[PDB]
Amino acid sequence: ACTKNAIAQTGFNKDKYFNGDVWYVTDYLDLEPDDVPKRYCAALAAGTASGKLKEALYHYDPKTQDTFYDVSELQVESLGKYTANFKKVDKNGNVKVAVTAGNYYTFTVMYADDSSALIHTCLHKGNKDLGDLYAVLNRNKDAAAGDKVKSAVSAATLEFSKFISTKENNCAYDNDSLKSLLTK
Numbered sequence: 001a002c003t004k005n006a007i008a009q010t011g012f013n014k015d016k017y018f019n020g021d022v023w024y025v026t027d028y029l030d031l032e033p034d035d036v037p038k039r040y041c042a043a044l045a046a047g048t049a050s051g052k053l054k055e056a057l058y059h060y061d062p063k064t065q066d067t068f069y070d071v072s073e074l075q076v077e078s079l080g081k082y083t084a085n086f087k088k089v090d091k092n093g094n095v096k097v098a099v100t101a102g103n104y105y106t107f108t109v110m111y112a113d114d115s116s117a118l119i120h121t122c123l124h125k126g127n128k129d130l131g132d133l134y135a136v137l138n139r140n141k142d143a144a145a146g147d148k149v150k151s152a153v154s155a156a157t158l159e160f161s162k163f164i165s166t167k168e169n170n171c172a173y174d175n176d177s178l179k180s181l182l183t184k
């Protein structure tokens with residue numbers, strides 16, 4: 001279950017965040033920790049496509065090789081806080097699992113600048129029981145978390161020492177697919 005009402009960044013700049021580019025997850029914290037593996041790869045693109053607010057997601061378990069992409073149109077709850085109904089797709093946007101009620105995530109941008117961000121998500125998927133997931137993002141897939149984003153982790157009353165890094169997993173990403181999936 002999720003337990004946090006994440007607070008969006010004061011003065012969040014939506015056009016800068018949703019600029020069509022890619023964000024890589026460098027570090028994550030799930031508050032139900034046995035909900036996700038301890039070794040993982042994830043990234044997203046975020047942008048407006050023909051007037052519609054979109055994200056494209058990529059997940060990869062580097063041990064099992066389990067791989068999936070998703071596309072969503074985000075709905076606005078408030079600035080920096082969204083509800084996203086997702087469809088599982090191949091890398092080319094062909095639908096594998098259609099949008100369905102009950103398959104959605106919330107998405108809150110707690111901090112962002114041009115290069116780094118801190119987000120919260122709460123996934124809802126069928127009858128699964130899932131927890132709060134925080135992720136540190138960077139534009140550069142190899143970037144160590146800087147003091148701006150680490151300060152934001154502290155300001156969220158979290159300990160960055162708790163976060164698990166994705167950097168030692170040899171993660172390789174198809175940026176081209178993420179960007180193109182925004183239109184799908």
Ligand code: HEM
Pocket residue numbers: 025028030035036037040041042043044057059068069070086087088097104105107121123125128133135
């Ligand atoms: C960047 C933020 C993230 C978002 C918005 C997000 C969103 C999602 C969505 C929508 C699904 C369902 C996909 C589908 O069934 O079509 C999913 C599944 C999953 N995510 Fe993420 N995720 C994110 C980051 C992560 C990270 C960093 C991890 C590892 C900690 C993770 C682990 C998982 C796992 C293991 C599943 C499979 C769940 C299941 O079906 O039981 N996610 N995520």
